[PDB]
Structure formats: C-alpha cells, structure tokens
Write an enzyme that holds these catalytic residues in place. Sequence first.
Site, mmCIF file in Angstrom:
data_model
loop_
_atom_site.group_PDB
_atom_site.id
_atom_site.type_symbol
_atom_site.label_atom_id
_atom_site.label_comp_id
_atom_site.label_asym_id
_atom_site.label_seq_id
_atom_site.Cartn_x
_atom_site.Cartn_y
_atom_site.Cartn_z
ATOM 1 N N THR C 94 -8.722 1.225 -15.585
ATOM 2 C CA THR C 94 -9.965 1.407 -14.895
ATOM 3 C C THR C 94 -10.551 2.843 -14.935
ATOM 4 O O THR C 94 -11.707 3.093 -15.079
ATOM 5 C CB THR C 94 -10.201 0.875 -13.690
ATOM 6 O OG1 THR C 94 -9.729 1.523 -12.631
ATOM 7 C CG2 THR C 94 -9.952 -0.726 -13.606
ATOM 8 N N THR C 95 -9.305 3.780 -15.010
ATOM 9 C CA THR C 95 -9.897 5.247 -15.136
ATOM 10 C C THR C 95 -10.075 5.650 -16.542
ATOM 11 O O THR C 95 -10.886 6.383 -16.790
ATOM 12 C CB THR C 95 -8.571 6.100 -14.709
ATOM 13 O OG1 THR C 95 -8.475 5.463 -13.135
ATOM 14 C CG2 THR C 95 -9.054 7.486 -14.197
#
Lengths: 533, 212, 525, 536
Positions: C94-95
């Site tokens: 997700t980063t």
Amino acid sequence: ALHVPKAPGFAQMLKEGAKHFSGLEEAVYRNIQACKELAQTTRTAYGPNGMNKMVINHLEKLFVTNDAATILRELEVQHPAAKMIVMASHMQEQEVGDGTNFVLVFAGALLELAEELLRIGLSVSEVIEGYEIACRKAHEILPNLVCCSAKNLRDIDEVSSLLRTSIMSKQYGNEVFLAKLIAQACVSIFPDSGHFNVDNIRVCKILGSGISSSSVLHGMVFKKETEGDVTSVKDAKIAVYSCPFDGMITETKGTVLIKTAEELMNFSKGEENLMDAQVKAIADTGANVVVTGGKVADMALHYANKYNIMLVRLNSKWDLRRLCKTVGATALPRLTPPVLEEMGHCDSVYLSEVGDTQVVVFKHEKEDGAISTIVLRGSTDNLMDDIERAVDDGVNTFKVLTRDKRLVPGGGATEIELAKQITSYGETCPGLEQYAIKKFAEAFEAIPRALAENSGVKANEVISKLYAVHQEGNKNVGLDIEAEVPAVKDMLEAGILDTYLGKYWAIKLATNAAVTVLRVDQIIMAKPAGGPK
Amino acid sequence: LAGEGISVNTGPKGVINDWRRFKQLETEQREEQCREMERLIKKLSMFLQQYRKQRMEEMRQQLHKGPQFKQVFEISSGEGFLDMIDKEQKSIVIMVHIYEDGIPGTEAMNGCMICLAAEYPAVKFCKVKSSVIGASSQFTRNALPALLIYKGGELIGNFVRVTDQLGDDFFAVDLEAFLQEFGLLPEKEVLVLTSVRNSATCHSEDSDLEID
Amino acid sequence: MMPTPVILLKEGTDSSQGIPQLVSNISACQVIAEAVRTTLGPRGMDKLIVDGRGKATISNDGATILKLLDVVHPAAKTLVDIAKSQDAEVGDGTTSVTLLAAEFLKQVKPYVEEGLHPQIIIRAFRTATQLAVNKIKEIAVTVKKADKVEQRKLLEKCAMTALSSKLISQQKAFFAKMVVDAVMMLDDLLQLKMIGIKKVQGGALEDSQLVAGVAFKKTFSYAGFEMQPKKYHNPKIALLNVELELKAEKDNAEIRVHTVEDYQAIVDAEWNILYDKLEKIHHSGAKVVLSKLPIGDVATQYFADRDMFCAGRVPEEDLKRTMMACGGSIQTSVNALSADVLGRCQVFEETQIGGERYNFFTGCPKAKTCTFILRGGAEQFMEETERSLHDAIMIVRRAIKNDSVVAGGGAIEMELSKYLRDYSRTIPGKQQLLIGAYAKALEIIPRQLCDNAGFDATNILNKLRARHAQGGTWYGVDINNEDIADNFEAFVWEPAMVRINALTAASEAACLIVSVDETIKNPRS
Amino acid sequence: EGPLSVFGDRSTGETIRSQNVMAAASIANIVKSSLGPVGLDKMLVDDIGDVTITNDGATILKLLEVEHPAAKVLCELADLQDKEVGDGTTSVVIIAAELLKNADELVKQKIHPTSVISGYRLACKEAVRYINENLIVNTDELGRDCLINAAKTSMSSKIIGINGDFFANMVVDAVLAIKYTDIRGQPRYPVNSVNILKAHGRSQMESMLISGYALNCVVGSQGMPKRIVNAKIACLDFSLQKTKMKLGVQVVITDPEKLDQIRQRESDITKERIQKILATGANVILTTGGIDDMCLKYFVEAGAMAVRRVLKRDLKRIAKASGATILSTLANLEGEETFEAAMLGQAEEVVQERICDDELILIKNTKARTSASIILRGANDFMCDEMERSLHDALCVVKRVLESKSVVPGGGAVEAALSIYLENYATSMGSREQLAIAEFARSLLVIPNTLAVNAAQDSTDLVAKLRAFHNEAQVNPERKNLKWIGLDLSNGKPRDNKQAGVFEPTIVKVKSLKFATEAAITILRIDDLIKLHPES
Ligand SMILES: Nc1ncnc2c1ncn2[C@@H]1O[C@H](COP(=O)(O)OP(=O)(O)O)[C@@H](O)[C@H]1O
Ligand SMILES: Nc1ncnc2c1ncn2[C@@H]1O[C@H](COP(=O)(O)OP(=O)(O)O)[C@@H](O)[C@H]1O
Ligand SMILES: Nc1ncnc2c1ncn2[C@@H]1O[C@H](COP(=O)(O)OP(=O)(O)O)[C@@H](O)[C@H]1O
Ligand SMILES: [Mg+2]
Ligand SMILES: [Mg+2]
Ligand SMILES: [Mg+2]
C-alpha cells in the site's frame, strides 16, 4: 440634489429583494451572456480529447467526469436562462442518452450569434423566424446525410464497432475493450422480439483490480452473503418468496391466550413442528435455493440448514423483481411450496469473494437471459463511476440504434455539411431572415471548432480544410484526431459514426431552447428567501 | 507563601450580608439566563390535498363580533416575561413571539396571532422583542421569527425559522393547521354571543328560600 | 472580470483551471506521498496519529495512515483511494502504490509545465504500464512441481518478506510459520473470518500462540459457574442457539386462569418447560454447552449439578469457528440433538491468559479454522501486530492462489526500468521522453529503501543499474550489508501480482489526475 | 514549547528548503508570462486606484509587496540587474529560480549542497568562458545596422515593439548625440542625459526627437517673449529675489531718517545684479531658485526669457550642452560682483512650445556640444509611462553595445548552445559535480522554453530541434554556422538569428549568469530558519 429617487409607478411598488429587468440590454443581452458563460464552462470537455473536471457538490461529494449532463447537474446554476439551457440538455439526455454537450454548445453559439444579429440591427422576431426556418431546413437535410445503417444487432463485432464511437469520447484511451463488453452485454439481452430494455443491463462496481479486469456475467451479482450454511449450488432451484421467511401472523393483532398448563407446554413444540413441516414441504419440491425479500426467522434458518437449503436475503424489492426476471421464478407471497410453473431455475449459484467483498452470483451457462450484468473493476471509486457513465452512454446508443438504425458521419463532418447546405440555401432566400439563416448555419461550426481546440490544433485551418473538401463533395470527411497538424480524413472508413436520431433530437432541442430564451423580454425575479432544497 | 490551611473564621461570616447582597442579584439574573438558554444556541447552531375548507375557514375566521379585536400582549421587560411565565395557571398554553422591527416576516405573524386569539381565548398569545430578552447576536441577526410555546412552565414548542415552513404570505388558517398537526393548539369550544355579560361577582349566594 | 448583476453559479463557487491547477494537483499528490515515505522497507518507521478524541494510532501500514489522515484535496484523495484498493485486492504494498503514483506525477510535472498535451502523457503511461505488466508476467519465477515442502517453504519466505518491515520483524520467522500453518488449514475459500485473532495484554511477543481449534473469552458467567469442572478429556460440544432461562413463553402470550390449581399448574409448567430443555440437552450426552442466546443462572446451576460446562452470549463468529473446528451444527431447537450435530474436540480447558479467562478447544483433527492469541505490552502494540499478521495472511492466501514470485528490494523495478528504457530508445521521441520518465520514476522504491536505511542512494542505484544492464535480474538492495545482492538467493520473495497491481493502480491514478483540467468547488450546504 | 526555548517559529531540513524553492518559484511564475516578443503586459492596481501597465520585470517586482525573505532576494536581484545592465531583468529572475529549483532536486537526492554549489560555480565560469570565445559577434563587422537591430530586439516585447522600425532609428540617433570622450581617450555615452518627456495626445508615431534640450518648465511671466531667435543662455544657481540680510545681521534704527534708504537697498541689490546679467547681452536666464515679481519685470522690459524653479540636473545638462557656466554667486576673485560674457551659453533657438494643452521649453540646436531629448506621445498617461520604461531599456541596450562592441544572438540561441556544451563538458569533473553542472546546463533551457510556451507552440519540439541544430554545430567542425540558430516565435521554427538581426549585448547574458548563480547559491546555502515573533 444628492440622491436619485425611485421613479413613480412600478419601480416604487416593487418588493424589497425583488429585481426587475426590462429591455434589450438589461435582459436579452444578459441572458445571452449567461448562456455563453455556461457553454464556455462545459466547452473543454467535448470530443475524445475532452478533459475531465473535478466537480464537488454542496454535499462535499467529488465528481470527476467529462459528461456534460453530469457536470451541469452537479453545478447549482443560478441564472434562469442557463437553467433553461440545462433543462434542454437534461431533456436531450433523457430522450436519447448522448449529445448533451452538443446541445449546450449549439445553444451557446446560436445565442451568441443572435446577440450579434440584434446588435447589427435585426429584431427579435426576425431572428426567431430565421432560426425556425433554418432548423426546419436542417431537419429536412439531415436524412440525406446518412452514410450507413446498423443492419444487424445480434452480431457482436458489428455492434462493438457501432458502439465504439459513442464510448470513444469518454474513456478515449481504451474504448475497444469497453465496446466489446457492452456489445456482449447488449447482445445477450435484446431477444428475437424487437423490444430492448435499457434497465435490463446491470452494473456491479467491485474495487481493486483495474478496469481491464472487468467482465460480463449472464445473470446478477449481489454484494451480500448467505444466511445459511450452504454456500454453493450447482443445479440451482431458486424459489423466490416475497414474504419473510417466517410463519405468518395476523394483521390486526395476535395474542396467545393460554388457559391450561398443557397448552402452555405444547405451544412452542407445535409452532416449531409447523415451521419444520412448512420448510420440509418447500424442500420436497426439489428446491435448494430460497430467496426471501423479508427477515429470516431463527427457527426457519435452522430448519433450512437442516435440509441443505441456500438462503439469500434481498433488502430491496427491485432486486427481487430483477432476480425473478433473470431466473424465471414468481415472487410468492406465502411459504407455500412452489409449483412447477412458478419454479425458478438457474445454472449455478454460489458465494464468491472478489477483491475483499463477498458476493452472491446467479450465473447462467447459456449466453442468454432476461438480465445481464457487468462486473466493473478499478482502482478508484470515481474511475468506476466514469466507466459506468460510459457504459450507460453505450447502452443508450444501442437502444437508439434499435429504435432507428440510420447513422451519419461524425467528427464534425455532418456539422460542416449542414452548415454548407444551410448557407447555400440562405443565399437564395431574400428578406431580412437571410442573416438569421446564415448565422444559424455558422453556429454549426462550433462543433468542429470545439473538436479542433480540444485536440490542440488551429481551428481555423481545420474549418477551412473541411469547407474545401466538402466543396468538392466528400461529405463524409471530418478532422483527424490522431495528428499533431491540422488534418482531415474520411469518417466512413474510420468508422466514426454517430446516431442520426441523436443528432436530430439534439438540434431540435438546442434550437428550441435558444428560441425560447430569445422570446423572453422582461424578467421579474423574486427575493431568493430560503429554499433549503 | 505558607500556612495555606487558613480555615477562615469570621471574614465570610462578617460579610455575609454583603455577600448575599450580590448573590441574590446573580441568582435573579441567572434565572432568566437559564430560562433563555433553553432556547438559544441549540437551535441557533444550525382535491382534499388542496384544503377545500381553507377558504371558508378564512371567511368565518372574520368573526370578531364582540368589542373591538384587541392586540397581542407586548413585553418590554425580561423580568416581566419571567414573572408572567412563572405566575399564571399552567393548565393553558402560553405562546410567545420574538421579533425585531423592520425585518420581514413579522407583520404576517402578528396578524396570524391576532386572528387566532379570537379563535382560542384560552391561549395567551404574546410578543416580545429579542433586544430586551438578551438574545445572542446570531439569534438576533438571523433567528428572530420564532413561535415560543410554553405550557406547564416548560417548553412545548421548539419552533424557529417559522418562515421556512410558512413563507411570508401564510394566513391564520395555515398557522392553525400547522400547529394542530403537532397537537399543540388547545381544542376549540362551542361559543355563543352573550348579550354583553351576566355575572358580577361570586360570594355567599343567599338565594330565594320560601319559609313558613 | 466584470461583475454580472445575476451571476451564473452560486456565490462562493471556486474554480481553478489550466496548467496551474494540474501542477497544484501534482504538488498535492507529492505532499500526500511524503506522509508515508519513511514507512518503507525493513528500516521503515511508524507514524502516530491522534484523532480528535485523543485515541492515538500507531501504524507502519500505508493504507491505515492514509485513511487516518483527513484528506480533503480532490486530487490527493485519489492516492488514498488507490492505497485502499491495493489493500483490498492484494493487502501488501500500500505504500508502494502511492510512492509510484507520486513519482510518476513528479517525473511528468516538468513536461506539463512546458505545455505538453496531457493525452500524450496518458497514452505513454498506458503503454508503459502494459509493457511492464507483461514483463512481470513473463519473468516471474514459478515452479511446476506442486511439492508440499517446496510450496510451504515458498509461502514461508513470502510471509517473512511481507512481515520484515513491522515491529514483529524480529520474530518474523516464528510469525511466518504460524501464519502459514494457519492459512493451510482453511479449506477452499480461505475466508478471513475463519482465522480468529484475539489480543491480550501482558506477555512477550514470543508468547503468542496459534491454537489448532477455537478459543474465546469467558462471557459473563452467572452464579454457580465456579462449581463447573474446567477440563474435559473427550467432551461432546452442544453448539446451541437457545435462551435457557425462565421467561415468558412468548412476547404476546397472555395467561388467563380462574383457579389456584391452574395457577400452580402454570408455574410448574413453566418450570417443566425449562427443565425439559435442560434434560434433553443433558441426555444428548454433551459435556460442554454453548449458546448464542443467554444461559440463565438456573441452567448454570443445573449443568454444575451434572458436572457439565455452560457458556452464554457467545459471539456468533466464535460459534461459527467452533462449528468449523469441532464439526457439529448450531441447533436452534433442542428437540433433535442427535450425535451427528454435536461437536467433538480432544481437550477443552479454561485457562488464565494474562489476567483473563479463555476457553480453549484443542485437539481437533478435522479443524478448518484457528485463532491467533496475540500478546503485547500495549493496545496499539497488539493492533499493529494484528495489522502485520493480516498483511502476511493476505499474502499467503494469494500465494496459495498462485505461486508466481519476483525478487523484492526493488530488483524487479530496476529490471522493469532497464526494459522500459531499452524500449523507449527505439521509438520516435515524443513517447520516448515520457516512457523514459516512467522508467526513471520506477526507481523510487530502491532509492526510498536506501534513504530510509541511511545509505547513499546514488551509489547503490548506480551499482544496481550497471548490474541490471550487464546481466542479472534479481539484484536489489541489501539493507544489512550496505550494498546490493541477488535478492532471489536472499529469499526476498513477493508475489508478482503485488507489483502488477501496484503498477496498474499507480498508472490509473496518475492518468486520472493528469486528465483533469478544471476543479469546481461548490459552497458547502 | 520544546527545550530550545526560543520565542519564534523554526523550520529545518527539507521543510525550509522546499519553502525557499516555493517562494523563488512563485516570483518567477509572476513574470514568466512577460518574456519574449509574445509576452504581455500587466495591470498593477495600487490599492487606491492607481494603475501601472508594464512589462518590465524590475518595475513589476519593485511595486509588489513580498514577505518571504527568499522571495525578497530575487526581487532585489531584478533591481540589481536593472541598475548595472538595464536589460534582461525578467530573464535573471526566471533563471535564478530555475537554477534553485533544479538544485533542490539534487539536494533531495542526498547530494550535498556544497557539491551543488561547487558545480554551479564551475558551470557559470565555463558558460561565461564559452560565450566569450564562440558566441560573440563583433559589431565592427556589422556597422550601424547592429545598433538598430540590437535596439529593435529591446523594443520587442514592449508596447513600442511593432513601431520599432521608427523607434530604433530614434533611439540610436539620440545616443550618438550625447557621446563624448573623456580622459584616456575612451568614448563614453552618458545615457539618462537624454531627457525624456511624456505628453499624451497624438499617436506614438508622432513622438519627437529634439535636436537640443527640452524643459518641463515655462516662462515666469506672461509678458515675456516666448521665442528667442539667438539665445544667449545664462544659467544661475541662486534666487533673484528681494535681498534679505542673513540671520547674523540685525537692523536697528535710531535715526528715523535712515529707514527709507535701507528699504531701498532691499530691492536695489537684486536690481543691480540683474542689470549686470542683462548688460552682457543675455537673452535667456535659467535659474534653480525663485524669482520675485519685480525682478520678472526687469527681464520683461529687456525682452528676455526668464525661467525659474529649473531642476538642478536639467540646468547642468543645459550648461554642458550650451557651453554656459553654473554661477552659484556673482563674485569674482577681486571681491566685487560682475558677470562676464564668457559665462554665457548659446543656442540657435529657444521656444515656448505647446504640447497637448501644456507648454514646455525647447532649447533647439545647442552649440559647442550636441544634446538630445525625446518627447513621447500616447493615448493616455498609462501608456506614456510604459513607453518611457521601454525606451529606457532600449537606450541602455544601445549603450552597452556601443561601449562593449560584442553582441550575441537572441531568441534562446545562447541558452541552447550552452546546454549542449556544458552537459558534454560536465563529464570530466569528479562524480558529484557532474550532476550539478548537468543540472546547470538543463536549467538554462527555461529561457527558450518560456519563449515558446508564451506563443502557444510546441515548446518540447522547438527546443528539441533547437538543441539538435546546436548539437550538430558542436560536433561538426564545418557546420559552425548553426551556432546562430535561435527561435522564431512568429512562425514557430528555428531560425538563424544572426541573419535575422535578433541581437543582445554580451554583457546582458554574462551578467545575468553571474547574478543568477550567486543568488541561487545564497538561497541554496540555507538549511534552517528561525523566525522570531514580533514584539507587538
Ligand atoms: N475518434 C473520433 N474522431 C473524431 N471525432 C470524434 C471521435 N469520436 C467521437 N468524436 C466526436 O465527438 C462528439 C461526441 O462528443 P461527446 O463528448 O460525446 O459530447 P456528447 O456527449 O454531447 O455527444 C461526436 O460529435 C463525434 O463526432
Ligand atoms: N529484507 C528485505 N530486504 C530488502 N528489501 C525488502 C526486505 N523486505 C522487504 N523489502 C522491500 O520493501 C518494500 C516495501 O515493503 P513493505 O514496506 O514491507 O510493505 P509496504 O510496501 O506495504 O509498506 C518491498 O518492495 C520489498 O521489496
Ligand atoms: N524578434 C525576436 N525573435 C526571437 N527572440 C526574441 C526577439 N526579440 C527578443 N527575443 C528574445 O526574447 C527574450 C526576452 O526578452 P525580454 O523579456 O523582452 O527582455 P527582458 O528580459 O529584459 O524583459 C530575450 O532573451 C530575447 O533573446
Ligand atoms: Mg456523447
Ligand atoms: Mg509490506
Ligand atoms: Mg528586455
């Protein structure tokens, strides 16, 4: 001698917050300016090279799109003339489905040229008469500009080619894949009977895997789960019930009057036995899937789990009706076992997870059915909403093709041909209405001009090229989008065609809106006061 | 700075009269402050369908009949409001109108109360400016037209921005129907036109008594 | 701008249009990506966000941090949306999606500033993303053996790589073994609700355990509960959905009697109904009784007198897990309690776990569920442990779906950047600049890893580029050794679809952001 | 508030560095739309309705109210360029902000700011060295046309650009008039000695070049003649008023008969001075001080023009041009008061010329020297002021070309050439400096990029073609004519700017690079900010 008093008469009798506008400069010119401003706001989102606009409504909800109708409906337009033009655009959206931006651009151009005509000396009545004459001439000419016809709607390839143009303006980068999806969905629907229902195409938006992972399912998908323990059926026997999955009760008022100990002891046993008998009677018909539109009783759920019966609960009656249509069942009002003609059938029902949302799928093996659904994927909610809007535009284009199969060349070819023919007709007409007719013809140039401006080329060169080419007689020639230099090409080979009915209705509505705005001479606005909604 | 355990002896005792002197004044002030606080802030932070009988109700609402038509009670002191709401029997409903002179949406309300007072003599329609009460700046600027309703010494009516659900051309029929929708107007009673009056006083009756 | 007496839109409508609007959008995306920049890789850090109420949250998870931010910028919200989308579809990286999207926008910002048509940039992004996805699919390493030991080792390595950025990274091998063992028990759908996760204060991380069964907290025992034995060596479990109390027979039941004998009969009949339910349950042979509905004190004393165990108000998910572990059914009626509807476990026991009482169901051979009992020193400690375990569980489930892996540490992205530069060198030149910018933006993650670890990013990137150009696909950042290494041999393994979805989401977000030319903000109602 | 306990805000690291870049970029973005022939002016309303329509970068930034210290650096950078060069004010702000913006990216890549500063300093020195060796054109081989072409480039992007055919000749002839040589025999051109008078009215094409001097003054009295056929100008730096004794002198009368004669001397002292001045044949009397009414009569009777309240700087220019001598007092070295004919300036005509309802003095055809003045005619005051600002730049440009006889091609030709050369030259200095010098090379391309984007053309393709042409020049020895290729904004294609006559003084580009580099270096040097809260 320090203040100018209000003139005696109507000026003094006016209310506090009211406003009165009268005459040409105060009313007609200002209405034209407001409509021109609205057209300017929506102009840049026209054609394949149109730009999406992030629009945030009063409810702090974000809309990003290039659909003119959506942009207009998400803007709280205040000026009444622009309100009227927005009403015309919405009417075009309702009647056809595509062409709202054309309506708005044409109305803006017509009103601007009407303002110019009024400035150079003509009267409002003369301008209105000229526009009506020119609109009748354009509607006469339009049938002769038809290049080809659909000629088949049960085919996938032909329908995809027809629908590509409609969904090329929106989602220009990837239109072939969406065209194939919508073509498959529409071909599954639209049986041998000529009637086609737009509402029969459902869209399910499941987030996560990019729009290229979208697909078409012959059936329906519900973002729910199964109440019971069974989560997979391979020879589905749906038995739809519109009543709650529970023993029915009296409608006035029911009280359990107990007068002896034995009745008190046996009441629960008898009620449970009755529930078990009803559920077993339902199951003995071979039904293995039960869909209910109401609540599910605990004992009913237990007895359904005992007999391996799948439970699906639909909250909305519309979903129940759609499931009945797509399965072939009748919404029973009581827990009576379904008879064979009321007996619903489907190829497969199961519980599946797509992304991170559990869905219940009613899947048909055959490429046919009353209702077909499009499972939309994507990495953003707004992106899926735009894909849904494009899907709606494509489906409406298919419906229009079912109604009328004629097509005219797009990309400004039809507009340029119409302008040329109307200008040629206006020369033959004497009297003062020739100026209005010529301005009506010139108003058609706003479409190729908008396309050229959005594509990033010089509009004047494109328009001159189009006039030349149509002067030799190639009436199927419009501007080439895939070119960094102003250029034109034939639209018939490129397959860039738009529906004749859409053009007809859009021209009619735009002309009517412009004329109706012009007819207004005085405005008496009231104090806005409240009006929360 | 030490010896904080003072345990004061008679200072507060010796100044008890002077302490009560302003304590009673503060209690009196916060009386009306609390009475008003129950209104401010909380709501300041934010073809039978066509009424066949509306017209006929309008014509026979023009039945003043008796002496003149009177006017709504005007309150010019906050203490007057407090000691009239505190007093008086709590059986009947008390309705209060807040207004500022000049702002639209007021004269129609006053006319509606004037017409309704004849219909329901039990109700105690009255009006008062927001300036004298001590309303907040926001309430004064954009919350003036409100129908305060009191019964039993406690609020029963929670109406502000009456123009929102009534407009500026509402008649007494509209206000009467709107209030009766929430069941706040006392039910009407059958009435007849007395000659003028009969009674004078009530005391020892000493009626007729035939005796041998 | 001359003031019209009757303006077109409502008062206070805000409209920003043109190149400055898009540049502002790119800057906003950069600002959002900065907030999660340092939470990348084994040397990443955690962010502490305090809400209005004062409830702080600590997370290394990019999606959680982005959600906890009250982002109102319309262009910046797309980054949060794609982070949530990546979390939903994949669960890890997700980063990376936000970093890649912001890097794409930053790379194409100069070309936008000089008046390049955004449609060209969008087409270039689409082409580059399609080529990169095809390359990932082509060069992903898979084994055509389906060997149990090899598959288990692959899953364990993937789980370790997923976990080696959180505070449980010290016990990453232990937790990866636990996660793989938990996931392999799920049958076909790998439903998350079948993996319980309980959090108890006190205890080291290594005290966390995975129960091959089901465990849940004690639920408001009534009087007489302490007289019930708390260990059974072959209990039969009666999963019930029944309220065993003295109550009204029905809500709308009214009893009308006119004799004292009838009154006594009614009282005895209520007692007999309750005792009939209890006697049926007891005669079913079960020794542990669990009910979704409450179980009264009378029933508790009745079961104590029979040396049985009872527990009422058990949460529904716990009962479902108990059903899956033991193999019975939740009977809403006790009228037919046959042997087949009674769950069976080898050992049931109630033990003390860090100041709390937990009921343990172990020894289930046919169990299709489990329960994680997480120990920690603080509430946020266990919350972050649960988030890390969720990431690992999603990774392992997806790896069960397909065993295609690519080396991590930016090696795959360096290979993709080399491939994209090679492609861009062979095209006219308008697309070449944008595809080269895409390839350069693909280098953000290895550079971010070097920056977070404290290396010199430029030298490491130069070495990586030279190695990839001269041969060697899986060469990425080696955090411990301050250098580069073959990350495939170093077992830095992640599923290829993770990078596939990251690239797809980042490209879609960048295209959507670039495609916007005007922003209209209506006044709030 | 923290352990430091300082009363003020604080920013450190990438936070303050981004702020400085943001502040510098904001100033550049203000004036990026006022660059090149396709640039546009700006209205600057001054909060009280005052309007200033201008294109000059210095004028825009001087009027603007700025708060950020980094922005103030660039705003003062523009003013320094205006004072020391006179042209290229907009370019230096754009380049400096672009230099800072690209340098920040390297710093974000963990490149130390000292290395970036070292790289920028090396690049600036070599850019100057390369320009002086390969891109300069000597004006000796061109002739008078280069001055017109150099001037015409200056009026381009100004409100007098299209009429630059007529304005360039007017500008050049004015500068050549005020030329004179000094010690060591080095000619110098005292530009700003060409008085510029603004007066609305007729079109711009009727702006006049006076072969003399013009005064924003009129004759003192309406009874004087308003034209002298043969002026004998006398310039005075004192007032011709009633004689009042100084503060240290007191008049005390004890014999009443003496009062009348003393009052006579209060006026006869001045009369004797004026009689001495007129006795030498003076026709025009110009004085910085005032003149009383009775003194005005003496000039009226003699038929002599007398102008009072003349500006001090105007008097010096007239005296130098006409050969007169400024006399602060009428005192010789013998202690007496006398006025010799040798202190008289001469002109062939002095006229009370009327220009659009206002009158001004025209001193035509001064002798013993040549002087020039310019009267600009416009539609209103707003356009007249902008004509003066534009004309001042043109005069400065011609001054630099005449003094330093080298010119360079315009239209981004120099910037494109430097970008090709520097990035090739950058491959020989260490490893850290290579990135900084290459960024310096790339940052220079903002000028040709900004010209193209103003004309709404494909800036990406034009710069690519422009760079391609220059690349061939630097690699092919026999194709060195491509160095002069620049931008043609009218048609949007590369064009040989040396042939097209688009020139600049070499000092404009060279001084721009030095000023922009040091300004960028100063901001790049900062990595922390402490902002003390004001005591108020
Ligand atoms: N590939 C294409 N090349 C040129 N013109 C196109 C192409 N696709 C669509 N168009 C034109 O774009 C117009 C549609 O614009 P659109 O954004 O759909 O507005 P509306 O929704 O009002 O029709 C049509 O008139 C069509 O001629
Ligand atoms: N031991 C390791 N050595 C080098 N790189 C690693 C290691 N573990 C993880 N990474 C890298 O860190 C990157 C980010 O992963 P991580 O920060 O754990 O999750 P997220 O991307 O969701 O923040 C991955 O691309 C992976 O290649
Ligand atoms: N006729 C022309 N053709 C091409 N380029 C020109 C022309 N005239 C000026 N330029 C270029 O435009 C740039 C902008 O100059 P300008 O902005 O007017 O000066 P300043 O920067 O002092 O305001 C100059 O660098 C010059 O080289
Ligand atoms: Mg359309
Ligand atoms: Mg991770
Ligand atoms: Mg200049």
